[PDB]
């Protein structure tokens, strides 16, 4: 089955569907209003026909329902009704940061610092649970109408958890296989510090409206990262950003994962521990979006 | 598609004699050209992984890798024609004869390393070196076999790459796992170390421990590579060969070509006559 706690009932008995959200980038997502509280939620609808694979969807719900942290999108349960799965989540009324900067242009360094602190808080919590987001980017950082920051979309993370379970289920007899082969089969070949690198790239994304090498063919970018002399990217405009921001980029984009700072360590960095970082900075951004 | 497929009736060319392998390697027949003997593996045509397996065997041309002769397509059945190894696998052998002598193990290890060094310079990985996949012919000569696991891993690596998504936010270690899999050909060197213990003791180390427990242990970093059970039975050279092939760190594990310079497999007197002696034991015991 997909999850042992699924509500086997029509979601429309609890929510009035209001409008579609996200333009389809996140699937079929509906804005909905609770019929008793009046609170707003987002409902993602996924098809669940009898003989489809449920493993990835199962992993995604398992990840969502065991998170209870302010900087992670809240989970309110799922509804299975007539071969449709509705995932009920916290509604973030300003969309993703990508939705926002595609209108406003590049974020200020202080706005990027607040965002980075809030994501690091969410990442420290996930890493403390032995979870890995693995798809940190502007599109998966959501903003509510109060200017707060919420990590969302564990679909990639669920995809990898499902691979891990399958490859482990059919790994076969292990008495002859090398330790490093067993470790890739059980652990995946990397660890939660990949999230720290992705935040570094996301910080550049917010500063420059594209990740580095966005205009390079994706298979070429993958190949360049595997070469011995590969150089981590940097911010484009040196004089636009303080040395603190430049250093933040340098350390998050540490090439060797053995030397890359963890999320708790990054929270002590000058850029995200400076005073004056609060949701008002993003309300300013939302006001610019509005004006 | 394989451009060399023979689109004709294989029984128009071979007499099908007995089955072989007890079904462990699939449906494979001992065949006689209709005086040469071949092995014919048949598979029902429902297949990209089967494609990839044949390409591995077809492109390999080395005396220590089981030879490939061609494939016939007929009545939705694919007939893969290969070199026949009349003494079966080393597992078939030692289950009758008992543990191999150190000299016999040394010769088998040299022959397998020769095949591995060829494979690794072809940018291939066997990934299932074990007694069951090391075959012996009637001359006592050693041939690596069964690239099915190698084909499946290469297909999983290719497919998971085709659904990896945009890579601009990916860390370089994640990129490396996507393109290269997370390990390399030195895993075959470790598997050979285990195999040599298998040939000496009739079982790989930890054979009587639950497999999911053995997977749990191998990833703990406190993990200690196994050793030969009975010290006084084997020379210091054998023990050292086990030590170096079972190097935990893949960054320090010697390559196949380097291992060919090890004392155990470079000593004189290593030849097929040792396995002819073994093949005499299975006949006379
Ligand atoms: C008018 N607005 C704001 C939108 O159309 C809009 C938008 N452009 C972008 C993103 C969201 C949004 C808000 N909250 C969410 C979600 C999303 Cl996608 C999810 C996370 C991903 C998916 O699982 C559903 C859960 N909570 C939008 F509503
Ligand atoms: C009476 N004997 C000896 C056997 O039954 C016997 C046996 N017990 C074990 C192995 C073989 C054997 C010999 N030569 C082979 C093959 C195998 Cl399986 C393959 C290698 C890969 C596989 O796909 C087909 C091609 N060359 C046996 F014939």
Curated annotation (Swiss-Prot), chain A:
<feature type="modified residue" description="Phosphothreonine; by autocatalysis">
    <location>
        <position position="163"/>
    </location>
</feature>
<feature type="modified residue" description="Phosphoserine; by autocatalysis">
    <location>
        <position position="169"/>
    </location>
</feature>
<feature type="binding site">
    <location>
        <begin position="21"/>
        <end position="29"/>
    </location>
    <ligand>
        <name>ATP</name>
    </ligand>
</feature>
<feature type="binding site">
    <location>
        <position position="44"/>
    </location>
    <ligand>
        <name>ATP</name>
    </ligand>
</feature>
<feature type="domain" description="Protein kinase">
    <location>
        <begin position="15"/>
        <end position="272"/>
    </location>
</feature>
<comment type="subunit">
    <text>Interacts with MAP3K1. Interacts with FBXW8. Interacts with CLNK (via its SH2 domain).</text>
</comment>
<comment type="similarity">
    <text>Belongs to the protein kinase superfamily. STE Ser/Thr protein kinase family. STE20 subfamily.</text>
</comment>
<feature type="active site" description="Proton acceptor">
    <location>
        <position position="135"/>
    </location>
</feature>
<protein>
    <recommendedName>
        <fullName>Mitogen-activated protein kinase kinase kinase kinase 1</fullName>
    </recommendedName>
</protein>
<feature type="modified residue" description="Phosphothreonine; by autocatalysis">
    <location>
        <position position="173"/>
    </location>
</feature>
<comment type="function">
    <text>Serine/threonine-protein kinase, which plays a role in the response to environmental stress. Appears to act upstream of the JUN N-terminal pathway. Activator of the Hippo signaling pathway which plays a pivotal role in organ size control and tumor suppression by restricting proliferation and promoting apoptosis. MAP4Ks act in parallel to and are partially redundant with STK3/MST2 and STK4/MST2 in the phosphorylation and activation of LATS1/2, and establish MAP4Ks as components of the expanded Hippo pathway. May play a role in hematopoietic lineage decisions and growth regulation.</text>
</comment>
UniProtKB/Swiss-Prot annotation, chain B:
<feature type="binding site">
    <location>
        <begin position="20"/>
        <end position="28"/>
    </location>
    <ligand>
        <name>ATP</name>
    </ligand>
</feature>
<feature type="domain" description="Protein kinase">
    <location>
        <begin position="14"/>
        <end position="265"/>
    </location>
</feature>
<protein>
    <recommendedName>
        <fullName>Mitogen-activated protein kinase kinase kinase kinase 1</fullName>
    </recommendedName>
</protein>
<feature type="modified residue" description="Phosphothreonine; by autocatalysis">
    <location>
        <position position="156"/>
    </location>
</feature>
<feature type="binding site">
    <location>
        <position position="41"/>
    </location>
    <ligand>
        <name>ATP</name>
    </ligand>
</feature>
<comment type="function">
    <text>Serine/threonine-protein kinase, which plays a role in the response to environmental stress. Appears to act upstream of the JUN N-terminal pathway. Activator of the Hippo signaling pathway which plays a pivotal role in organ size control and tumor suppression by restricting proliferation and promoting apoptosis. MAP4Ks act in parallel to and are partially redundant with STK3/MST2 and STK4/MST2 in the phosphorylation and activation of LATS1/2, and establish MAP4Ks as components of the expanded Hippo pathway. May play a role in hematopoietic lineage decisions and growth regulation.</text>
</comment>
<feature type="modified residue" description="Phosphothreonine; by autocatalysis">
    <location>
        <position position="166"/>
    </location>
</feature>
<comment type="subunit">
    <text>Interacts with MAP3K1. Interacts with FBXW8. Interacts with CLNK (via its SH2 domain).</text>
</comment>
<feature type="active site" description="Proton acceptor">
    <location>
        <position position="128"/>
    </location>
</feature>
<feature type="modified residue" description="Phosphoserine; by autocatalysis">
    <location>
        <position position="162"/>
    </location>
</feature>
<comment type="similarity">
    <text>Belongs to the protein kinase superfamily. STE Ser/Thr protein kinase family. STE20 subfamily.</text>
</comment>
